[PDB]
Design a protein around this ligand. Sequence first.
Ligand SMILES: *[C@@H]1O[C@H](CO)[C@@H](O[C@@H]2O[C@H](CO)[C@@H](O[C@@H]3O[C@H](CO)[C@@H](O)[C@H](O)[C@@H]3O)[C@H](O)[C@H]2NC(C)=O)[C@H](O)[C@H]1NC(C)=O
Ligand SMILES: *[C@@H]1O[C@H](CO)[C@@H](O[C@@H]2O[C@H](CO)[C@@H](O)[C@H](O)[C@H]2NC(C)=O)[C@H](O)[C@H]1NC(C)=O
Ligand SMILES: *[C@@H]1O[C@H](CO)[C@@H](O[C@@H]2O[C@H](CO)[C@@H](O)[C@H](O)[C@H]2NC(C)=O)[C@H](O)[C@H]1NC(C)=O
Ligand SMILES: *[C@@H]1O[C@H](CO)[C@@H](O)[C@H](O)[C@H]1NC(C)=O
Ligand SMILES: *[C@@H]1O[C@H](CO)[C@@H](O)[C@H](O)[C@H]1NC(C)=O
Ligand SMILES: *[C@@H]1O[C@H](CO)[C@@H](O)[C@H](O)[C@H]1NC(C)=O
Ligand SMILES: OC[C@@H](O)[C@H](O)[C@@H](O)CO
Ligand SMILES: OC[C@@H](O)[C@H](O)[C@@H](O)CO
Length: 720
Amino acid sequence: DEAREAAAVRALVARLLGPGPAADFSVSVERALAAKPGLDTYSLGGGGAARVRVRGSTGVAAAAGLHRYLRDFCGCHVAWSGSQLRLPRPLPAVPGELTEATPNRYRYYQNVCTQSYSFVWWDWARWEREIDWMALNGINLALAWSGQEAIWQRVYLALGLTQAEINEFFTGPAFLAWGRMGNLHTWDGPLPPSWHIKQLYLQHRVLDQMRSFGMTPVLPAFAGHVPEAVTRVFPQVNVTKMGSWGHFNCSYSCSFLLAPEDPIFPIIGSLFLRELIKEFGTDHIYGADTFNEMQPPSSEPSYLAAATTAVYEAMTAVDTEAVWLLQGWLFQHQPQFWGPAQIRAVLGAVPRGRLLVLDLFAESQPVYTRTASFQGQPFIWCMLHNFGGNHGLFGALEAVNGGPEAARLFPNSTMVGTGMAPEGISQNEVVYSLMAELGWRKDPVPDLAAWVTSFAARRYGVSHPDAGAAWRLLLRSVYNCSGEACRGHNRSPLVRRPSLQMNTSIWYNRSDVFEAWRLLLTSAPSLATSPAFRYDLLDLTRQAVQELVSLYYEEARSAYLSKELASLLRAGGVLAYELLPALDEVLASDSRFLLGSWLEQARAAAVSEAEADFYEQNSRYQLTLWGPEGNILDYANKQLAGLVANYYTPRWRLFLEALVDSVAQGIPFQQHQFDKNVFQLEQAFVLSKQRYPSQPRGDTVDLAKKIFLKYYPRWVAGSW
Ligand SMILES: *[C@@H]1O[C@H](CO)[C@@H](O[C@@H]2O[C@H](CO)[C@@H](O[C@@H]3O[C@H](CO)[C@@H](O)[C@H](O)[C@@H]3O)[C@H](O)[C@H]2NC(C)=O)[C@H](O)[C@H]1NC(C)=O
Ligand SMILES: *[C@@H]1O[C@H](CO)[C@@H](O[C@@H]2O[C@H](CO)[C@@H](O)[C@H](O)[C@H]2NC(C)=O)[C@H](O)[C@H]1NC(C)=O
Ligand SMILES: *[C@@H]1O[C@H](CO)[C@@H](O[C@@H]2O[C@H](CO)[C@@H](O)[C@H](O)[C@H]2NC(C)=O)[C@H](O)[C@H]1NC(C)=O
Ligand SMILES: *[C@@H]1O[C@H](CO)[C@@H](O)[C@H](O)[C@H]1NC(C)=O
Ligand SMILES: *[C@@H]1O[C@H](CO)[C@@H](O)[C@H](O)[C@H]1NC(C)=O
Ligand SMILES: *[C@@H]1O[C@H](CO)[C@@H](O)[C@H](O)[C@H]1NC(C)=O
Ligand SMILES: OC[C@@H](O)[C@H](O)[C@@H](O)CO
Ligand SMILES: OC[C@@H](O)[C@H](O)[C@@H](O)CO
């Protein structure tokens, strides 16, 4: 109720600022503050000689008001990487009563993938910080995906499956996103008993905390995928075996899909939802997806309607208030299958307003556009932005700034909210800061250059003219990809398998990055004490090294092709023996860029050495080979200390060496042979029991300065 929501926001203020400064805020929650039912509203008053009055129509609204006040009146900044929470004394006064309402019924957060790429090894402490970030960003709808395998285990045991069948079925922890969608099964499991104990524990705390703010946590439901062992206990079920996803064979993919009209369908679907709800309660919104990246066995509208009605009916068969949150990714991913009549069949099969669809990649491939606003079903306009959790400076900020407005103005628009659905978090914080803001604004931000200048100013605690100019440069270059082919996948040579056919082209002027780097480095004598400045300088230096690797690749390749041995040794030499080690070393100077920081999260999730080794191996697979044969090679690449020294660099050394051997003998370089040798090194990184440091070493500013002094003059002079 109102009181519990206000107490939740009061406790947020105390975690955020300390209990001392928290006493200067008067928080309340009052339903009547909203003019229109379900359009969240906050108001700010007071300050100066008086306490700061923050009122919300809900707990999330109040938290958004708090953020509004801290950002625009106090100059504060909150992000995944850290915060800048200096309060002026006295606290600034607000003129009269400032009251703002969102035009969005929902602000949504999380991809299904984010659960595996970023949240896998999170404990409660980390989730608690994330739910605060969510509340401050005004989020009222989000996935609560933890612990669902523990519920499926109860269901399957009750259906007569053996514990061994259940253990064989789930993937390892790092691959559960794809197990849950039916893309995968089995790969790199089993889930150990401690996993379920910890995830059930976690999920209860997540749900309690979300609900205390008045957030709506979305819960999973059955979408038709079942383990093969279901055909042992129910041997007359009608099932179709799906195709291979992600180049996995039938030991790991080729999922069994239960036919929509099989009598077992509502029985399994109902038993799962009932067990889920007994354990966790419900807020009446359920997520399910049958055909994410998997071609349905028929394009007949009548079949596709029945497959969709079967899932919705299983939900309403236990909860008559059910609303089904559906990912729209498939419509964009297999456009040749998903013609107008196929899409109309799914969208028409659930009553209007009971399908809430995520237009998941709306900043670049919106579907509302080509389906007359999902044939009248409500939708949430999502920015996807990031794939694989990849590091790399990227954004299409003009398209995100104008996107929600265009969706709202579209004829017969059924837009009911905005969302952020990155595959991984902990990158490109500027992009999420903007899209979160668009959650509450009526209009696009009018001047992006001034906005990014203020973003940097609040983040560093000072408006520096060089740092400001650096960010304006990044805004118009890396953060302004335009066109239909803008994807935030890092495909740079640094993170990919070396070859003679790598494409080094980009969507911006490379000089803008090197200038931005120079300008940000010039700011260091003022800003070096800001953890956020250190983070951004490191991220930008890292980007500059990524650019240099590409440029040195170009030189090495041209020299290979001309049989210029000395030039090839020189160019390939600085790439593999100087640039890459320099990168690893500078990354190693901050805890937020250590492979070892993430792997120690994995060890702390385990309860034994053996289990910890298993989780760490899971993590190393996920970042590199993905599957056992390099099935989705480098898709979840990252630029972390340890990973660059022991994975990216050995591949480049081997590649250079094979090129110089080729030029030195008579002999052409053969890709297929190098492909076999480099696979041994990639796999060795995965299977090694090497431990990686979780403590930083060296000074970030000093190391970045050395890289700049050495490589920047070579850039301006063209002399490699
Ligand atoms: C589906 O894919 C998996 C993973 O690639 C296959 O399992 C793998 O099978 C291979 C070949 O049998 C094993 O590799 C090695 O083969 C040599 C044979 O000369 C042997 O000396 C080594 O000890 C080793 O066994 C590999 O261990 C195994 N990998 C895993 C992760 O289990 C599987 O066979 C494929 N399934 C189908 C149905 O095709
Ligand atoms: C927006 O919605 C309305 C649905 O009411 C569509 O207009 C109806 O359909 C045709 C026009 O193409 C007319 O014969 C009906 O009489 C219209 N109804 C009304 C009340 O005007 C309209 O076409 C939709 N726009 C788009 C782009 O699909
Ligand atoms: C993002 O890119 C687009 C394309 O370069 C920019 O939009 C142009 O802005 C100029 C003014 O400088 C206008 O005269 C043009 O009409 C626009 N061009 C096109 C092709 O649309 C935009 O300024 C860039 N955004 C940022 C924030 O730097
Ligand atoms: C299985 O279900 C599909 C419809 O989903 C149907 O085409 C097929 O005839 C059914 N097969 C059997 C053996 O019942
Ligand atoms: C790299 O890709 C771009 C389009 O994305 C294309 O125009 C270009 O020709 C490609 N370069 C090479 C060398 O193949
Ligand atoms: C990129 O920046 C450099 C240096 O300011 C400039 O010489 C060049 O003409 C710029 N633009 C393009 C499209 O190359
Ligand atoms: O406006 C204040 C609210 O806290 C949020 O919606 C921000 O605008 C974006 O973080
Ligand atoms: O590539 C496998 C990834 O984990 C997913 O994000 C999707 O398959 C991308 O389309």
